[PDB]
Design a protein around this ligand. Sequence first.
Ligand SMILES: [Mg+2]
Ligand SMILES: [Mg+2]
Ligand SMILES: [Mg+2]
Ligand SMILES: [Mg+2]
Ligand SMILES: [Mg+2]
Ligand SMILES: [Mg+2]
Ligand SMILES: [Mg+2]
Ligand SMILES: [Mg+2]
Ligand SMILES: [Mg+2]
Lengths: 520, 304, 101, 37, 132, 133, 128, 72, 195
Amino acid sequence: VFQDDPYLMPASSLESRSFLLAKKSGENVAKFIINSYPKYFQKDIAEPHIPCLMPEYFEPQIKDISEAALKERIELRKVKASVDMFDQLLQAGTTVSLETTNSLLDLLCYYGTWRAKNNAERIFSLMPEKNEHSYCTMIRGMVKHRAYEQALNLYTELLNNDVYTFNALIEATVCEKWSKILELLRHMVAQKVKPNLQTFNTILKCLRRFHVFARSPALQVLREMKAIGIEPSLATYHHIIRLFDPGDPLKRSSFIIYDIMNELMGKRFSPKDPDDDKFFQSAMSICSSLRDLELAYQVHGDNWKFIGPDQHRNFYYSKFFDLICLMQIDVTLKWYEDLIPSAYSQTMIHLLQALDVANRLEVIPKIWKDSKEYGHTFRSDLREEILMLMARDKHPPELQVAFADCAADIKSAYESQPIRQTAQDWPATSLNCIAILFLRGRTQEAWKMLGLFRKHKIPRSELLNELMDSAKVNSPSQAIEVVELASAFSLPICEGLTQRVMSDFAINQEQKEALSNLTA
Amino acid sequence: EDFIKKQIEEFNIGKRHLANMMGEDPETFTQEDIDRAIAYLFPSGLFEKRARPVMKHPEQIFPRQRAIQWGEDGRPFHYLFYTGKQSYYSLMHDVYGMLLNLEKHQRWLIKEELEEMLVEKLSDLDYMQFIRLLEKLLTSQCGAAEEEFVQRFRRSVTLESKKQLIEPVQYDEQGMAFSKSEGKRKTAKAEAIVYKHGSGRIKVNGIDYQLYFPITQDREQLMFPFHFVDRLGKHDVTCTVSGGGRSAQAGAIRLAMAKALCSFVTEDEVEWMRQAGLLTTDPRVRERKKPGQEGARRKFTWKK
Amino acid sequence: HYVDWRMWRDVKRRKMAYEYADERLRINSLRKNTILPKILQDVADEEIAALPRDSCPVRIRNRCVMTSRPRGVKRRWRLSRIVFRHLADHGQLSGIQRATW
Amino acid sequence: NHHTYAELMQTLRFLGLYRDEHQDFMDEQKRLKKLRG
Amino acid sequence: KNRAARVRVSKGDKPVTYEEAHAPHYIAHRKGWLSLHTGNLDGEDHAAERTVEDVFLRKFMWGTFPGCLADQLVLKRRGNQLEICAVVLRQLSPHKYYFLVGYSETLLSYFYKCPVRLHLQTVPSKVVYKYL
Amino acid sequence: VDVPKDLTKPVVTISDEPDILYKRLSVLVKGHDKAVLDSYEYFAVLAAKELGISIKVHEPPRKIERFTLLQSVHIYKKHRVQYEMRTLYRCLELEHLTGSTADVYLEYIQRNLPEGVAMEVTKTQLEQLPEHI
Amino acid sequence: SFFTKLTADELWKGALAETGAGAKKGRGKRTKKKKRKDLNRGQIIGEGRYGFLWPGLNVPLMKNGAVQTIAQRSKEEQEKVEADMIQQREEWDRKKKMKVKRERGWSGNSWGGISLGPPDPGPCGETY
Amino acid sequence: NEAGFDDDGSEFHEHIFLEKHLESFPKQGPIRHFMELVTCGLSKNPYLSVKQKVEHIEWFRNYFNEKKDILK
Amino acid sequence: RRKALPPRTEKMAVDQDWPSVYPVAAPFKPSAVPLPVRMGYPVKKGVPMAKEGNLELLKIPNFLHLTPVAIKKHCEALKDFCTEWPAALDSDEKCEKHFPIEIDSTDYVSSGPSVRNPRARVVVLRVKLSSLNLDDHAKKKLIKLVGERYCKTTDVLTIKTDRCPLRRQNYDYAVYLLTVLYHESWNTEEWEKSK
RNA sequence: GGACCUGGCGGUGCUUCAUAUCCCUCUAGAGGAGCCUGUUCUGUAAUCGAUAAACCCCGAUCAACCUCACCACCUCUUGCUCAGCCUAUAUACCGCCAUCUUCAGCAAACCCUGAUGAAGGCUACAAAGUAAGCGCAAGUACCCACGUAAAGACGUUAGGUCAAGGUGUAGCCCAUGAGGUGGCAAGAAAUGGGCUACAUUUUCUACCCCAGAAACGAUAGCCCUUAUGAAUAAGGGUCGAAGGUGGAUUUAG
Ligand SMILES: [Mg+2]
Ligand SMILES: [Mg+2]
Ligand SMILES: [Mg+2]
Ligand SMILES: [Mg+2]
Ligand SMILES: [Mg+2]
Ligand SMILES: [Mg+2]
Ligand SMILES: [Mg+2]
Ligand SMILES: [Mg+2]
Ligand SMILES: [Mg+2]
């Protein structure tokens, strides 16, 4: 969906989101222009007539109560229905058809809040003829758009006089209630409805949180589901996996569910429940807590559509790469360097600590360069982390050139942004390792950089060590005009200068030695 | 200057990727493979090769440019730099030294070829002076070093054949020897088979010439080949023709009969026939008509 | 927004001739047939004469599309010679080369 | 139909999406002409 | 002296592109056709429609990506599906680019009742063939 | 490293009816570039060889249609400018070819067209005699 | 029509007429000269007569971390923006057409007492 | 090249054989001659369908039936 | 302000699934393609323009996709679907014996939104009467009826049909015409007996 | 007014040249008659423009009605056009081209000479010229490497073209815009380009070339048929003259 050139190449999750949202907004603008000026695109130049390409017609026809009623279910709104009820009740006083009244009630309950109150209190004027369909759709509406006492009253009225109707009724009853839940389940199973288990899914959704006294009975309820043999175990299974949430991991149940989802993966899947999108995200959320790599590989035909939203995809990939990092890591970095362009701070931090524990120093540069190429700019948390981890090292002598290069790039990025004020406190935190790496070939750069640092300070023990190594690595005056100044500045450089002045520094001139004596 | 090596390594990695794409081991791979692959993967109806797509090595892509001829400080490297034409002058100096050395002891190379060998241009009369110096050297004795020095520049004469191709004799059933040949014309194309041992009558598309060509000059033309060689009634021939013009068909069959007889007859006689000039297809064809002209060459009346 | 009023007239004539095309063909056949009555051919002929103007396909003109130039237009592309040469020179259209023959 | 073409393009320039250089020139000189009488 | 799709020679301060420097007698010899369709071949038809629509498309795209393009368009019609190729400058933002891309793509699709796609290559500054 | 486990294969059904048998599929491609035509026919013959069927190749003549237009606008008849549309033909014949193979190969090629090309199929299939005769 | 219309550069060329007999021969004309102008640089692509607010190009796509939606600019602020653009164009034209003040030397229309500033810097580097 | 536009399942015999549409006139008259020629031309025409052909036929029927005043 | 990342050239390895990176037809995109091939008329002391701004490579047809390796893979994948020709049918005489009635249709394909073209309707068919008629009177009758639809040098009667717009209409009409023609050549008349 | 720089011009000198171009030369033609088609001019209410070379089967690879832009008459007034205008201006222009061109020069950017003047810059056994780039050329197209096409820069004719289209300026904006009926487009005359023949290399006949007869010529006019059309073209019968190979001059190869 994204373009190929590098400039248009979306190099971050938020900007990519905004980009394809702008594309969708252009699609909506196209819809608006076509449905505002249909006559322009009315020409059917293409030989195969396609209603997908034909302009769209939400235009009410002339006043015609019967055809207007038939067009009600075509226009998909509520003002037309109000006007039609008005025309049929006030002056006509007749019903075009009970099916038409049922469809009107369907639409009005779907559309639903004082407006919902008015829409629900304006349906009782409907002609006496109100069958089950009408009553149970009123229940549907009062449940999924308003409070639950009204739905309960309507259900009692119906009893005095469907699968997802009773589903909504159970939702209303539930949303501690032990006897309620029990009698509900009992009479529901007693009736001959034979639900599609969406009632069970909804009662699970309501049981999202409870102790073992309903977490464990869910297992036998699922075993009964399996015995009747209806459920694919797509959503209720995942919801009980989530309900397992937790002061202590349950390794036994974890292994059991591992085998279960293993055979579920082995078999082929077909979608039936609209809530299979939270499946992916919360499943990987539980996987992250579990921390297992064979588990991650198991969780990894066209079942990749259930990821959907970029937020859930982000959570999944983040937890996946985090587990893979915190698991050698050669195969992990292989998988990563394979999926980085397709895939999208915390992940990079985990990568840095994984590379540290691995000791693969040569890899971190390329990773930092990739992050910078994509979106890593105007933030120094990861810069601090990489600098500390890379200059805790000095063991590669030839790699000091790469140290200097990446340090120069890091400083080029660090000094970009004055107006923001955020670049002022970055050197105070991470300039020490940067300057040490610069010292480790080129030295004048690090010299003047430490000058700028101290002339911005927060001295440090490794800063003292840096100053000492720099001074000892031939030029007395060039070393003095730095070490003596930093000593006059602060006391630890002075207690180090006490020793520095022995070799060849104090013999040059006494005015700076006099200043040192005064400060000491 | 590093740009050159960058392009070289880019070309190397691109050659590797292209070998991988076309499906061959990158070790064994050739410029012919490069050319064929780029032609198949990016065809183009452009007529000029220089305009068509080409994947070539940077060293021959870029023309040779003279590197920095003076060091970073002070003096230059060569001792003629403060004047132009330094390489030419040094070459002339060495040449004159060799000339006077020989004195005390006692094909050619194109101008632009010399230019592209060096990194300097020059003038036509300067080139002529260089040629004069070379020929003055060669008029006298020359050692092995001098001969190889001169032949560094001298190129292959590349002489042509100046000969008429000989078609192969053939044999068919009941022990019948023969030879076939083909000829063409303005708009007529024919091919004729000659039988050496046969003789007498002649066929034309299944008809004899005596009644196929009512006019005499056509028969004179088709007889002219046999008359020159003097072997007249010792060879019979069949022939097939496809054309519009009578004289066109006549010339076509004449050329085909000659190209068939040159095989049987000796190469000496073939050379005699070439000297006679009846073994070459006429390149002359009806000139095109132009848009503003009344014909191919005639213009409308200049009215003044 | 056609280019000019003569283009407008051409379009009106085209539409009229189209929407009266079948009738013109039928009655013209009834006129040009031979075995049918002369009086019937005459009926058909005054019928055609009473038919409205701008209805015959002879009054229309294969005018240009861009410049509204009536003369010097190619039927295949429908463009004027000038616009055709412009597009060919700038290489906008496809598969057209200069005749270097 | 130039009707459809030009009407669409005029409406779209009114929306402010197609910067019509020719129409910009035309109405700029129209402004100047109505200014100078 | 003929004036046809060729740039007058200046003192040498006029950057010019490949096709704009080359003359209209170098079309097949040292150039390619910007559009590619089969209406020009023998036996086919609708060529006038192809030409008028491709001209309209070029104008519309020039005016819906104004000031960013730096070269002529390339049209590639493989059977039903239509493909466009452009070269642009990195002046405006990728937000702008993608939004107008989707917009014009939808417009072309709904106008021609045809599947349409377009690609665009970014350049920092216009590529110059010669200084004329 | 990412290699899929279960490759989704589309379903196929062998209907009870027999498949038609084409005697000769002769395809004729018109283009503007002989090089593009050479690449296209190389593609086609390579696919046919790999599928294991016969093949034939030959290059019919190049056809050209040229025409004269006025060089200038108002008054210049001596000075004209010419143009020419060049079409280049290439033929490919396939004999003893089953109906389903014909279908699949034709859709493959039809999706693998380049732009500046036209493709003309002539199908020749044999059949037995009717019953009314 | 839309097809009859054409782009800006050739239009400006034909309108200004820098070529032809006028410029050639040095005859020129009697002190009439149309100055070139660029209209595309002035107005940003977003606005038009009917001011639909565009999250993609005219308005920032995100505000308060929330995607925006198409909306209408009412006639009051529409006229406001139009007057602002009128004022901006007027200021641009004013800044374009102004006086030119080269210091008076020996006399007006004479190149005597004028200085061209220092010479150009040399290739090897010579500050003059 | 006929993906769609099946002509409402029409048939070649419905296109060509118009003898059933030809019932209301004898076998010899000039109207018979003219309408036979019409049917020939229509069957030769592939562009139009049985619908357009029968509308043509009905139009001819109407017109010469209101011109039935002559029958000469 | 914004800066474009460097191209994918250094990112792509020498061993790579080019069929996967270019599955279908698409433009060149030198940013994605690492090959430094250039195309353009060179200037004196110059070279063709680099691949970046080279829109000549864009306007020319594109064949980076569909490499020989990709072709091999697609062919060996689709072999699962392709069928086998009857081995018994291996010669012209044998196939025309098994199925004498040859029939052939045809249609062009052209770039554009529309797909219908009138030439789709035309179809023709061929058959040799050496083995089909099985009699002499009806044979002489049929050859007298048909004027030029036969060819005795090749010994084949060939007939076309285009009177119908639909290919299936053409087919059915040709079959019915042939049937009625055979049935009417079977019989005869007295004026035909008198010759 | 004196002396100078550059260009043009010379019925200006010397030398080398002229490819179908200068001639001498070769062929076939035009200016003879008729016809077709343009132009000038006459009259008409009845377009417009080019109208030496470098226009005259030119805008036109088309005018019986639209094409039509003229004119008489009759109607519309926000008019398909967020109007329109075939209104003047090609001496505002773009766009497109003739021209020398059947040329080979044009040149940004530098240096030098002339006392640091306009201007000029050539000597090869060499004395201040160096050169980007354009063009020529080269290469490409047709059948080759020749040939033909193509290309053919800088500039001149204020060259043609606001009537292909748009646009600057100036105008009509009940009109100088728009719509529908009609005819307009003939020749006392002159001229141009082309066709036909004025003959026996001709005319007729079957064939396209071994024959037999005659000793010509209408693509104009009259009548008729048919072609498409709602309302000029091909064919057939009659008419069977001018015409006898061109008046100075002139065209193409
Ligand atoms: Mg010319
Ligand atoms: Mg003054
Ligand atoms: Mg007219
Ligand atoms: Mg007017
Ligand atoms: Mg002029
Ligand atoms: Mg030419
Ligand atoms: Mg040339
Ligand atoms: Mg003038
Ligand atoms: Mg007529």
